[PDB]
């Protein structure tokens, strides 16, 4: 066998000297950055002055020398939305490629009625980038319901001439505006106007980001043949006044990551030095663009073979970006001006400042690194821009620097820097169509200042252009933009001629960071820190994590029974690793039933002296365990990669995941616990494989630290990380007599849960095993005559529904991520993709495509994408089912899986396409996706069809528009939702976790009432309130007014009062998302009363909630409930038979202990859900206004919203 970690992330080549300073730098504290660029960027005053001068007399011919779009609005007084609905309907119009075809649709049937009738994909896809044109603000989603009554009204005032208008507008944009030409021909021939006045071109051909090998051939054969006419018209003229291209290398494969360096410089390279060849042949410039910070240093790699690659000698035409908002920019250069020295190329290098800001503050956020990989003030840019400059002009001889900007200050500075002594080829600068040639129209030309300037020029289709215009419209249209400066009145001539350099030496702290902008470990401020993960981008993090985790997998890993007067033998067993079960991670000794039920008397005999520890104290723990763990995450990745069979990526998310249950329950015990919040006793917690060390961890954290002595039944395929795990805990301060671990089979588990002193279980893993343990638990009570609590976590048939206003490659990435990430072994995971007929194939195409590019294989590499399932018998029944689909005619599409897979447990990543949501009948815990098609008008019976599997965990939606997020969100039964944006990894404390139905009990594991529940009085949890009142409970209220029960209708208004129902909140959490919070009702809450003022009481909690209810018929109290209000009547039904008239969500039951006991098994003797059951005596509902609690009477939702979905960041626009 292969050793482990032995190939796991290798370089592609040595890290040279200049190569390592570059690594040193990649999230370097902004302090530490700025000094050395404000020293490089240092001027004379003399030559201060002289650019301020340059830079005044720039900005005044820029405002001396009125928008289309402004004028249209202006003309027919059009309202903002009905600007932007109008160049939505224009550009529809636009997608008639007959002119007289259009312009009778427009006179005949557009201006004189319904639009809509004449135009499966709304008009309105792309309004928010229309938004951004007409209003210069991003809005992320669209209401397409006022852009429509916008489209209407404008339409009925103005008719067929506003039409025409929008119509010329629009097709001027797009064809002349945002691009040069629609195609390379077109943009050739329109540019021969300003080369004649002394610019140049590179063309930028618009590709970006493939997603599948076949949308990497287009952009290669699109980059072919636009240098074949750019070289044509080039004719000669050279690399400096003739035309170039551009080129992004995420265009040329669709796996351009570290992760895949191998298959980059294996695949992706080649096609480069073949274009580069071509391009050397026609003498013009061929320009790498940069893309985002992760792919920097491996650009470099094909920079540098490049450059070093004799085939390609005698051109000096290859170019490249560097990025002056990232802290590496400097030391890049210092590489790059080196590589140009060492191979004798002119590297033409295209100093910008950076088009992806936003996204790089979101992913180094949602990564929890240590800083950010670009500064966070837009000054600190600026200042790294001219110290950049600085540097690549002092080397004119082996580098042409080009500089690309729209800023006029920035450009003064580097004219008189550059000094007096110019020529052609010495220098440039650069701008964007469109966009830069106002200001460098005052300097091109012996008139102006006589410097050259390359106009980057898209060049594209409507769909082309339009599928990244966003992100090209912040670029100059951020609140700290130059051009957006420019065109504010409110800014004078002297804001904008502020020199940065000297602004910035003059702050009280250099360099400091962005006030408003969190580092990752800030998130959630006072509250708690953030855990921290690794950046696999980075080669010294890679390095050490190879050693680590080849360290770790020498280790003798070990799990025993740790009772709490020591280790206990038993039966021992070898743990193998799942991707080979050569590779023998260590030795379980497993627990047997006699030592099982030990363990439960000697937690009962210490729980006494475990609650004693004050909750802060317990708490305190729970941190230290969270340092410790991260501190150990290395070696802790290294044994869930070999025992659990995880990627080294999901391994990192999972010990976040943990550290992050510690951290998040020890400080909800700091808002809540006190003295009254009594444990409930001896706490059972049963762990899945899936999350080995982050489920294992959270359910004993909170057991714990709610004051419980813990019985920890680790999965029996993963016990060595869960060994880990006490030991950390331990170590941390938790006494042994209050953490115990048995490992072993479900016997263990079993009898764990049957033991008389088990005073509630923690289940997560199958219904089927749930619903066991719940049988188990319905022959007992608690020594108060009480059901035992129960939390099961138990899964999904979770679907994400995709209409034709989403964008295919976001939604492929988040499908590929949602159902393979992990081998579809997330309880989370994507199980059934519904996509909208219009745009099923294309997305079906691109989905497939994707499925092919995955790397399935041991995950002690990190180019393997999935890894293996957790067993043979895992393997065995997820085959079955796709050989069960496969016979019934459905088709199968499957990646090929290598030989080494053989010595594992393997599944390849399968897309199954189904007729209907009902041919899915089993949960299949695989890398399965199955695929169904729906019509547009079917959307709301969809739904309804996800909601009737009777499950309720993860549920996606890409959409951009209002009217169908608040659509499926409203009527979707689950407990996550994720907006544009994948359905996997929550995060505690930002998605609390945990569904409804057939998925769980709740209450949700990272949320704020997961506490509550393992306790025998709850406490009132953070922000847990609500101002709404349900109005069937006021009704209901008035009705017992009316009938005399005074004291009920009391205790009525007071449950209005106490319900948290209707509470709804946002939690903090990354840049670019919103995560909201909400209490809805649970549904219908199954009623066993005793006493007419029982059932009273019953009603009250549950009508205060929101649930309608089914009252149990054999109680005889019908005549208690006479004259009942409509309102209440609609929420009430009374059941003979509970089976026939589930589901229900939950149960109230009144009675003695054997009453209680009684109606406890024949509730779990319902099929369907479990459910979470509260009992009360009679005289405990006389006694205690709290019998029944109505924590427990609510459902918890969360939902997530991709905000920068539609291209940027909104609120980030207003950071700077
Ligand atoms: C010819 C040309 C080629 C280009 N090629 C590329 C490319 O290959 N790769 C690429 O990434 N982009 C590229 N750009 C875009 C460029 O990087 C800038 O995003 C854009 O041109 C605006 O910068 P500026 O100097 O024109 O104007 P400015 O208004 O001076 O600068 C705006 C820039 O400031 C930065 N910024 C804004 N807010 C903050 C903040 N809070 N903290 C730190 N920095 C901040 C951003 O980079 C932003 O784009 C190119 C631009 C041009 C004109
Ligand atoms: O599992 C064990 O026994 C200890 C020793 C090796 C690493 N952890
Ligand atoms: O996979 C997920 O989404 C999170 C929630 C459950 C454990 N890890």
Redesign the pocket.
């Known amino acids: 066998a292969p050793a482990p970690f032995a190939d796991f992330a290798p370089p592609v080549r040595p890290q040279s000297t200049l190569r390592r300073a570059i690594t040193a730098a990649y999230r370097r504290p902004e302090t530490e950055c700025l000094p050395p660029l404000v020293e490089a960027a240092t001027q004379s005053k003399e030559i201060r002055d002289a650019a301020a001068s340059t830079a005044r007399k720039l900005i005044e011919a820029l405002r001396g020398k009125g928008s289309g779009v402004e004028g249209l609005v202006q003309e027919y007084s059009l309202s903002s939305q009905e600007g932007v609905a109008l160049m939505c309907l224009a550009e529809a119009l636009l997608r008639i490629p007959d002119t007289a075809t259009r312009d009778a649709l427009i006179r005949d049937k557009i201006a004189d009625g319904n639009w809509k009738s004449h135009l499966s994909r709304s008009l309105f896809v792309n309004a928010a980038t229309w938004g951004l044109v007409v209003t210069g603000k991003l809005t992320s989603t669209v209401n397409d319901r006022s852009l429509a009554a916008a489209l209407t009204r404008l339409i009925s005032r103005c008719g067929e001439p506003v039409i025409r208008r929008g119509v010329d507008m629009a097709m001027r944009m797009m064809g002349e505006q945002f691009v040069t030409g629609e195609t390379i021909r077109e943009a050739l021939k329109r540019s021969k106007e300003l080369e004649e006045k002394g610019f140049s071109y590179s063309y930028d051909m618009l590709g970006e980001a493939a997603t599948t090998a076949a949308d990497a051939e287009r952009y290669y054969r699109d980059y072919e043949s636009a240098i074949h006419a750019i070289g044509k018209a080039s004719a000669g003229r050279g690399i400096y006044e003739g035309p170039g291209i551009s080129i992004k290398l995420s265009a040329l494969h669709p796996r351009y990551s570290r992760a895949q360096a191998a298959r980059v410089m294996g695949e992706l390279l080649p096609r480069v030095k073949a274009l580069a060849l071509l391009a050397k042949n026609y003498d013009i410039g061929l320009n790498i663009?940069?893309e985002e910070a992760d792919r920097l240093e491996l650009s470099l790699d094909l920079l540098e073979v490049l450059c070093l690659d004799g085939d390609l000698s005698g051109w000096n035409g290859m170019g490249f970006?560097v990025?002056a908002?990232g802290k590496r920019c400097p030391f890049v250069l210092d590489f790059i001006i080196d590589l140009a020295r060492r191979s004798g190329r002119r590297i033409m290098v295209?100093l910008?400042?950076?088009?992806?800001?936003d996204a790089e503050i979101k992913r180094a956020q949602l990564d929890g690194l240590a800083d950010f990989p670009?500064?966070?003030?837009?000054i600190?840019?600026?200042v790294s821009y001219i110290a950049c400059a600085a540097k690549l002009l002092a080397a004119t001889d082996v580098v042409f620097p080009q500089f690309?900007?729209?800023?006029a200050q920035?450009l003064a500075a580097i004219y008189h820097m550059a000094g007096k002594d110019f020529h052609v080829g010495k220098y440039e600068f650069?701008?964007?169509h469109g966009m830069?040639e106002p200001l460098y129209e005052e300097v091109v030309g012996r008139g102006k200042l006589d410097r050259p300037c390359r106009i980057?020029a898209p060049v594209g289709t409507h769909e082309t252009l339009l599928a990244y215009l966003v992100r090209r419209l912040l670029?100059?249209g951020?609140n700290?933009?130059?051009?957006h400066r420019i065109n504010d009145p409110k800014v004078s001539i002297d804001e904008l001629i502020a020199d940065p350099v000297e602004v910035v030496r003059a702050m009280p702290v250099v360099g400091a960071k962005?006030d408003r902008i969190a580092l990752p470990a800030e998130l959630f401020g006072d509250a708690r820190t953030n855990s921290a993960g690794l950046d696999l981008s980075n080669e010294e993090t890679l390095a050490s994590l190879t050693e680590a985790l080849r360290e770790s997998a020498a280790m003798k890993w070990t799990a025993l029974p740790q009772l709490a007067t020591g280790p206990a033998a038993g039966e021992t067993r070898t743990v193998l690793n799942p991707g080979d079960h050569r590779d023998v991670v260590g030795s379980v000794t497993e627990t047997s039933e006699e030592d099982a039920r030990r363990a439960v008397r000697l937690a009962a005999d210490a729980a006494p002296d475990w609650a004693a520890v004050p909750p802060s104290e317990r708490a305190a723990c729970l941190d230290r365990a969270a340092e410790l763990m991260q501190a150990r995450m290395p070696t802790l990745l290294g044994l869930i990669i070999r025992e659990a069979g995880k990627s080294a990526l999901n391994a990192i998310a999972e010990v976040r995941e943990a550290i992050d249950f510690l951290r998040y329950y020890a400080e909800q015990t700091r808002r809540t616990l006190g003295p009254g919040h009594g444990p409930l006793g001896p706490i059972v917690c049963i762990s899945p494989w899936n999350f080995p060390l982050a489920i294992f961890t959270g359910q004993i954290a909170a057991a714990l630290v709610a004051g419980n002595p813990v019985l920890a039944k680790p999965a029996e395929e993963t016990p060595l990380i869960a060994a880990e795990g006490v030991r950390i805990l331990r170590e941390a301060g938790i006494p042994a007599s209050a953490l115990q671990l048995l490992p072993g089979d479900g016997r263990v588990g079993a009898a764990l849960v049957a033991a008389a002193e088990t005073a509630g279980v923690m289940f997560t893993g199958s219904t089927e095993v749930a619903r066991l343990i719940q049988a188990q638990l319905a022959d007992r009570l608690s020594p108060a005559g009480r059901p035992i609590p129960l939390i099961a976590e138990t899964g999904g048939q979770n679907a994400m529904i995709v209409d034709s206003s989403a964008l295919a490659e976001q939604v492929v990435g988040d499908v590929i991520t949602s159902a393979f990430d992990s081998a579809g072994q997330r309880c989370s995971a994507l199980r059934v993709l519904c996509l909208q007929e219009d745009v099923a194939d294309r997305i079906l195409t691109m989905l497939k495509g994707a499925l092919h590019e995955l790397h399935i294989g041991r995950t002690d590499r990190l180019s393997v994408d999935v890894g293996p399932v957790i067993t043979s018998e895992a393997k065995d029944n997820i085959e079955k089912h796709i050989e069960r689909m496969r016979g019934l005619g459905r088709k199968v599409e499957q990646i090929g899986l290598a030989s080494e897979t053989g010595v594992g447990t393997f599944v390849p990543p399968t897309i199954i396409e189904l007729e209907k949501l009902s041919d899915l009948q089993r949960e299949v815990f695989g890398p399965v996706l199955h695929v169904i098609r729906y019509r547009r008008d079917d959307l709301d019976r969809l739904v309804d069809d996800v909601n009737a599997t009777g499950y309720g965990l993860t549920f996606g939606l890409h959409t951009r528009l209002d009217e169908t997020i608040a659509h499926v969100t409203s009527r979707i039964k689950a407990g996550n939702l994720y907006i544009n944006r994948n359905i996997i990894g929550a995060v505690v404390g930002v998605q609390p976790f945990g569904g409804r139905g057939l998925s769980g009990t709740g209450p949700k594991a990272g949320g704020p009432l997961y506490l509550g529940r393992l306790v025998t009085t709850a406490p009132v949890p953070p922000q847990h309130s609500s101002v709404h009142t349900d109005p069937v409970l006021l009704d209901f209220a008035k009705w017992l007014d009316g009938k005399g029960a005074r004291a009920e209708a009391e205790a009525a208004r007071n449950a209005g009062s106490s319900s948290a129902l209707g509470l709804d909140l946002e939690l903090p959490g990354p840049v670019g998302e919103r995560n909201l919070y909400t209490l809805h009702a649970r549904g219908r809450i199954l009623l066993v009363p005793a006493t007419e003022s029982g059932l009273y009481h019953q009603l009250a909690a549950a009508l205060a909630t929101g649930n309608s209810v089914a009252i149990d018929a054999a109680s005889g109290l019908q005549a208690s409930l006479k004259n009942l209000p409509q309102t209440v009547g609609l929420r009430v039904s009374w059941s003979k038979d509970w089976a026939a008239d589930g589901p229900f969500a939950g149960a109230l039951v009144e009675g003695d202990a054997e009453r209680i006991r009684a109606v406890n098994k024949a509730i779990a003797a319902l099929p369907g859900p479990l459910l979470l059951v509260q009992a009360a005596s009679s005289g405990e509902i006389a006694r205690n206004p709290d019998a029944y609690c109505l924590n427990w009477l609510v459902e918890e939702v969360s939902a997530s919203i991709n905000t920068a979905a539609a291209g940027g960041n909104a609120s980030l626009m207003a950071?700077?």
């Open positions: 663009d940069a970006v990025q908002y295209r910008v400042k950076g088009a992806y800001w670009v500064f966070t003030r837009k600190h840019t600026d690309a900007t729209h800023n920035t650069q701008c964007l830069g980057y670029e100059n951020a700290s933009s130059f051009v962005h950071i700077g």
